[PDB]
Amino acid sequence: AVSIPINNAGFENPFMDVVDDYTIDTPPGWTTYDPNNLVPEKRTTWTSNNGVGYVGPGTQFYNQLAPEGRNIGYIYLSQNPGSGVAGFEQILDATLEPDTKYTLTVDVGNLAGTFKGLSFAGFPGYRVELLAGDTVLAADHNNLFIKEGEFKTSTVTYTSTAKDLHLGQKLGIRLVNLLQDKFSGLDFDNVRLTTEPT
Amino acid sequence: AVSIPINNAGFENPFMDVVDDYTIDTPPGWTTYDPNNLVPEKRTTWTSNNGVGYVGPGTQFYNQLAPEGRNIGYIYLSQNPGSGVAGFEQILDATLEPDTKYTLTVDVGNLAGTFKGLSFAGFPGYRVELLAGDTVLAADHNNLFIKEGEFKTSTVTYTSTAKDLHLGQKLGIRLVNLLQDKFSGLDFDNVRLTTEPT
Ligand SMILES: NC(=[NH2+])NCCC[C@@H]1NC(=O)[C@H]2CCCN2C1=O
Ligand SMILES: NC(=[NH2+])NCCC[C@@H]1NC(=O)[C@H]2CCCN2C1=O
Ligand SMILES: [Ca+2]
Ligand SMILES: [Ca+2]
Ligand SMILES: [Ca+2]
Ligand SMILES: [Ca+2]
């Protein structure tokens, strides 16, 4: 298996100085996936947003460190459950090749605890998608159980054929908060994509 | 793990006398899932339809028999790729219970060969969904590679918590043809759902 490079794959940029601090602007390498217009252009804390968070020693919200490095990438939706889905997207330069198995892996985090009166109990559900063009080739919609305060690795696989309709289209990755329950913040880290062509 | 009963779980009803024959009406136990209005009420062969098919000895379209029994359940969409998704749905009497792991398994078939000038080469993609009410709790969107002429088992899992928003809602199953490529017929068989509550 050969790795396909992913920009800002660990959400390590921007660098953060203080544990549990966070940015509220889309991290470099990624764009905001927002089909239901839940995330504003002008960002503020306490409203729907995305960014990075420093999950380091002494974090109050996990029983572990970030899966990789210092930071995680998060999507927080304050709208009520059922309002839509949102998250991160990254379109790669690599294109879909025939007779190839693609393996997309990402760690998904269930924030625990409470912050200034807002409980982090509960989890909104996640979906990890592998795209070619605008088509979702394969996705893991919420199959893993993630305990409060831990991360778990999601794996998504797709195998192309020699006559796949989407051959030559750009590969893409989406990391989605399903907003199916509250607390509706969701963390991701350590994105990896491999191929095993013939 | 305790099995939850599923009506017409193997698509064995109606009974079929001739290998490779098929019905074009929704099988009992299931309804037609058709969010994009691709499947007509008045059914004809050669247009979008669903039904059962007898995959028995001497079948021309598989290198194996039906996963279970005589028949499979199919969804055939003749619209072009990208037109929408359709399939089967079944709403169960069982309701979502707290602190329970649900395991949904179904065999998915990739029809092979050709029939009267129409090639069965290619595969449209599948999605298997576990529902509570109208919410997709978990789904396997097309993660398995299925060779031409075989079936493979898809597994979908969901673990509920003690305060799940959808507790007490009816469980449901959807079996979906993604219409992401042609040939855009898709087979299913041997649906099973288990729970492992505390
Ligand atoms: N997901 C993390 N580990 N840390 C950052 C969370 C930031 C995210 N966005 C916000 O505006 C804050 C408000 C309170 C809860 N928040 C969130 O969940
Ligand atoms: N899926 C099976 N194993 N058998 C039945 C297929 C029936 C399904 N519906 C139809 O009207 C026929 C037309 C030709 C191709 N068909 C299909 O794929
Ligand atoms: Ca990281
Ligand atoms: Ca939580
Ligand atoms: Ca059967
Ligand atoms: Ca086929």
UniProtKB/TrEMBL annotation, chains A, B:
Mg(2+) binds at residue 6. This is 12-epi-hapalindole U synthase. The keyword Membrane does not apply. Ca(2+) 1 binds at residues 10, 12, 68, 71, 189. The keyword Translocase does not apply. One of its GO terms (molecular function) is metal ion binding. Keywords: Calcium, Metal-binding, Signal. Ca(2+) 2 binds at residues 110-111, 120, 122, 148. It comes from Fischerella ambigua (strain UTEX 1903).
